[PDB]
Design a protein around this ligand. Structure first.
Ligand SMILES: [Fe+3]
Ligand SMILES: [Fe+3]
Ligand SMILES: [Fe+3]
Ligand SMILES: [Fe+3]
Lengths: 198, 198, 198, 198
């Protein structure tokens, strides 16, 4: 069936002071909603293109599909990676994993921070699981659909687009990137890692 | 552990006339080998960057990692998607799936062909499974790591980079794209779809 | 010599209500300043790379140079394309040009608006002069350095990055894009066109 | 008027052994011809889009325009940057310039070589003149239209796409990149630099 805008497991304001409610609100209700509509439209244009046997606009239809489905997939996971009762550090299996792959939770965290704060333009920082080599790796995503291999399982993401913090942090994206660690919902990531490693 | 250059399940020449042995040879032994080395180097630079607590070159390290791990992941699957005893059409579950999502195997195939022949520069055509919406979709990949959402499971790919056919088809990439249907190994794709839908 | 942050020909607030002073301020003093420093650093890294005969990081040095020199070049022109005493329509040579190349100033303006409001991620809308074919064309720039040919002379640009309007228009980028027409400084564009056509 | 496929100032074979005639032939007659047609088509789609007051496909029309006009602009200059009677080193003003901006012709040349041999996918190496800062700089172009600022004047380019050497050098692009120095037509570059610095 169609793609749909998910419900947050919390109130927009629940993340203050780390993330203003106004942000979460426009983010969810305007930005994410827009991707979901775009993903569905893209899918429909394809059907219509397929029926008329007219792929003249294949390049645009395929690019619209990737961009919008990618924004949807990303925000879908972002809402879950966040939580008012989170913060602290990972635990158990996930933590031993992380320390074994990035030397220590602190070192993982320095890299991830680096990756999110150096994007040239808009993008995200994401931790994922590589199934080919069975390794935990950090990628620097450009926009929403660029810079990472096919089949990588996403575990944790940090939205670096300006719409994600300009209202509250203005140009100080380094601050926003630090504040994030207070709202990460480790029960989710841990969960995702468990499923990915199965 | 490290990433490694896989072995082909066939002899380089096994695909003639559809795909010259000389191609398969340079492709596997030179191009793919290069990605695998690059993927391992990228991974190491990260470790070294992590130890020195020096992420000054984060952008390059992350981009090298995505590009090379992506070429590796892609060729890894390409070798399996090919077979001297393939061709024909998909069967069973996969075929009903394909006809249900693209109207008919013929229509799927017209779209896929369109997607591979219109790349602007180098890229690939790929069929993948979207887990968010549980749908079969075709994407037009740019280079190796661009244009598609995170977490998409790759099922079938068609290498559109010039190195994949210039020696034999020269600039006639439309011909190469047609010849491909004779060597697709449907037992593999079908297999992948089965695992993806589980 | 080095690259330097130019002075605005006006006060930050001079564009209200169309463009808030707070924006112009962070935009000029934080964002643009950052590109200028980055452009100079990029240039230096190259010298140092050239002296040591060590181009191991060529890809990053070249990408840093393009990104930062491009942001600098872009904002440099943006400040000039804006003016408190502007608005209205182009005049003389430029206007006949524009109507002859886009049918009418109104049609040019519909296209330009379309180009700026559909960027996927961050970018700009720019009108430039193609010297090869001697034509006026509109391009949709991605980020700061992507999507247009070498040697194109830039005449007018509209910054579509979120930092350019999020504080005041929030996610309503369509509004910001309309408000812009009130502050365009046609004496500048006209001037640039004159020099480009010489 | 329309865009047109230029005539070479030489015979396809004139560059052997450095560059096979077969290459120059398919390159000029197939590849470049394709960009020119594409550039004209893109321009027409815009007119038609403008008349119907229907910019639904703005993103594709603008991307087709940039890609094809960019390939055209690039090959246009490549044919001129090449010559059977070239090679050697730059002379006069251009040479003092080059040594002053890259330390020495040898150092310029090491950088340029680095830039062309590390492209991730398809692209070019280009020397251009920055008018904002009045400096000679080397850029690493991705595809044909990406990675460099607006208004940069192109002086010399080296086509790194696989179609530019696969037939003769196969995957050994490092060799092709070396062979190029024997056919550079310095009278052209010098000329371009003169006009750019005016
Ligand atoms: Fe976002
Ligand atoms: Fe390949
Ligand atoms: Fe800006
Ligand atoms: Fe070429």
């Amino acid at each position: 069936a169609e793609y749909t805008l998910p419900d947050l497991d919390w109130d927009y304001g629940a993340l203050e002071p780390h993330i203003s409610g106004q942000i979460n609100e426009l983010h969810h209700s305007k930005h994410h909603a827009t991707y979901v509509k775009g993903a569905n439209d893209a899918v429909a244009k394809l059907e219509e293109a397929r029926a008329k046997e007219d792929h003249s606009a294949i390049l645009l239809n395929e690019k619209n599909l990737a961009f919008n489905l990618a924004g949807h997939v990303n925000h879908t996971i972002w809402w879950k990676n966040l939580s008012p009762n989170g913060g602290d550090k990972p635990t158990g299996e996930l933590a031993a994993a992380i320390a074994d792959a990035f030397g220590s939770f602190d070192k993982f965290r320095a890299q991830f921070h680096a990756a999110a704060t150096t994007v040239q333009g808009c993008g995200w920082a994401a931790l994922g699981w590589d199934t080919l080599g069975n390794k935990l790796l950090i990628f620097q995503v450009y926009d929403h659909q660029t810079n990472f291999p096919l089949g990588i399982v996403p575990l944790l993401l940090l939205d670096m687009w300006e719409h994600a913090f300009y209202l509250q942090y203005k140009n100080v994206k380094v601050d926003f990137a630090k504040a994030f660690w207070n709202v990460v919902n480790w029960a989710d990531v841990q969960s995702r890692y468990a499923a990915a490693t199965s």
